[PDB]
C-alpha cells in the first residue's frame, strides 16, 4: 500500500532532520488547513530568547463548525497555539490579509461568497451561535474558487478567481449596500475555463495576471475598457495552470505552476518566449511562492507531498556526477516532512528561509533548511 511506503519514508525523513534543517517544528491542528499566510508583525518578548510570529490558517471540516484562525508561533529572536477563532461558513479555501491593513483578512468560501473580516472586531473565542459574521460580503461570483489577491499599491482593491470562469475585482472601501454588501467594480471574462489563480503586479497597480484550466496565462490592464480581452494571452502550459506569482524584486519576472508537472518562468518584456521550465516527476503543481528575501529563490508544492525550493542563479551550472544524481542544480532543496498533499505554504517575511507548510492530514510544519544548503 501507499500508506506503508509513506509512514516508512517519513521515519527516514524524521531521523535525518538534524542534517537537513536548522529549524523544524511539527504541529497537528484539530482540522486540516487549506491555507497558510504569515502575518507581517513580530512581537519581541522582554528577556526571552524567542519572538512571537503569527499565521493566518483556516479549518476544513465537513461536519463541524469551521473557523478562520490566527495562530501564534515562538521563533528564535517553540510553542504553536491558536490565539483567535472566528466562525466561518464552510471551509476556508484561502485567507489573505490586506497589505495596507493586516487586521483585514479576505476569505474564499466553498460558495459564490468572498468574505472580508477585521479580526480585531471579533473576540478571541467565538460565540456558540454558529453564525459567520463577516464585516463585508463581496458579490459578483456564481461559484467557489481559491484564487485571491490584494492590490499592494491601490488600497482596498481585491481580485478573486472562480470556477464560474470569471475574475472579480472589488474596491472594499466603496460604500456597502443592503447587508454589508459590495458589488464587483469589474468582472474579467477572458478565460473559457475555471480560473485557478489571480495575482496583482507588485509595482504596477493596474496590472494583474490570471491562470486557468484553459492552459493560458492572461495579462490584464484595468486601465483598458474591454474586460473580456486581456492585454496578452500566453500559451503557458500543456495542461491546467493552477498558480502564478510575481517576483518581489524584479518588476518583469513572474512564475506559473501547472498540472503538466512544471513551473514556468516569464518575462513581461518577452512573453512569446518561456524563460525556463522547472520539472519535477509526477507532481501536479498547485502553489508557487517567491522568497521575500532572495530574488532568485522560489518554492513549489503540488500533489507529490514534497515542497521544492529552486534557485534560478544555479541554472546551467556544472555539477559533480554525485550531485547530478539528485537532480538539476536549480533544485536547491526538497522538504519531505509531509505525509499528505501540501495544501498551502508561506515564507516567513521577517526570518529568512523560514517556511510554514500545511497538509491535508492536518499537519502544519514550521521549518528552515540548514544555513549550509544555501551558503
Amino acid at each position: 500500500v501507499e500508506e506503508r511506503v509513506i509512514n516508512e519514508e517519513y521515519k527516514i525523513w524524521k531521523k535525518n532532520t538534524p542534517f537537513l534543517y536548522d529549524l523544524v517544528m511539527t504541529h497537528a491542528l484539530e482540522w486540516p488547513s487549506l491555507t497558510a499566510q504569515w502575518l507581517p508583525d513580530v512581537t519581541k518578548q522582554d528577556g526571552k530568547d524567542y519572538s512571537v510570529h503569527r499565521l493566518i490558517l483556516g479549518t476544513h471540516t465537513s461536519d463541524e463548525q469551521n473557523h478562520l484562525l490566527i495562530a501564534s508561533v515562538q521563533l528564535p529572536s517553540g510553542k504553536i497555539e491558536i490565539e483567535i477563532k472566528i466562525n466561518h461558513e464552510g471551509e476556508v479555501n484561502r485567507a489573505r490579509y490586506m497589505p495596507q491593513n493586516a487586521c483585514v483578512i479576505a476569505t474564499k468560501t466553498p460558495s459564490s461568497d468572498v468574505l472580508v473580516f477585521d479580526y480585531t472586531k471579533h473576540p478571541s473565542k467565538p460565540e456558540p451561535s454558529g453564525e459567520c459574521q463577516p464585516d463585508l460580503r463581496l458579490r459578483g461570483h456564481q461559484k467557489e474558487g481559491y484564487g485571491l489577491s490584494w492590490n499592494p499599491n491601490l488600497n482596498g482593491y481585491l481580485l478573486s478567481a472562480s470556477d464560474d470562469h470569471t475574475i472579480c475585482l472589488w474596491d472594499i472601501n466603496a460604500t456597502p449596500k443592503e447587508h454589508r454588501v459590495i458589488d464587483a467594480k469589474n468582472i474579467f471574462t477572458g478565460h473559457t475555463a475555471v480560473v485557478e489563480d489571480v495575482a496583482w503586479h507588485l509595482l504596477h497597480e493596474s496590472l494583474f495576471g490570471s491562470v486557468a484550466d484553459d492552459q493560458k496565462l492572461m495579462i490584464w490592464d484595468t486601465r483598458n475598457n474591454n474586460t473580456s480581452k486581456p492585454s496578452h494571452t500566453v500559451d503557458a502550459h500543456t495542461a491546467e495552470v493552477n498558480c502564478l506569482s510575481f517576483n518581489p524584486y524584479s518588476e518583469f519576472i513572474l512564475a506559473t505552476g501547472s498540472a503538466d508537472k512544471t513551473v514556468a518562468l516569464w518575462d513581461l518584456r518577452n512573453l512569446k518566449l518561456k524563460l525556463h521550465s522547472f520539472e519535477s516527476h509526477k507532481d501536479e503543481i498547485f502553489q508557487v511562492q517567491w522568497s521575500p528575501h532572495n530574488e532568485t529563490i522560489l518554492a513549489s508544492s503540488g500533489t507529490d507531498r514534497r515542497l521544492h525550493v529552486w534557485d534560478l542563479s544555479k541554472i546551467g551550472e556544472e555539477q559533480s556526477t554525485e550531485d547530478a544524481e539528485d537532480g538539476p542544480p536549480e533544485l536547491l532543496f526538497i522538504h519531505g516532512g509531509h505525509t499528505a498533499k501540501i495544501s498551502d505554504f508561506s515564507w516567513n517575511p521577517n526570518e529568512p528561509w523560514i517556511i510554514c507548510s500545511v497538509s491535508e492530514d492536518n499537519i502544519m510544519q514550521v521549518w528552515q533548511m540548514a544555513e549550509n544548503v544555501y551558503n
Binding site: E9, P18, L20, H281, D304, R306, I334, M369
Partner: peptide, 13 residues
Amino acid sequence: NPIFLNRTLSYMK
C-alpha cells in the same frame, strides 16, 4: 520521488 536531496545532507557536504 526523493524524501530529500542526498547533496543537502550536512554529512555529505
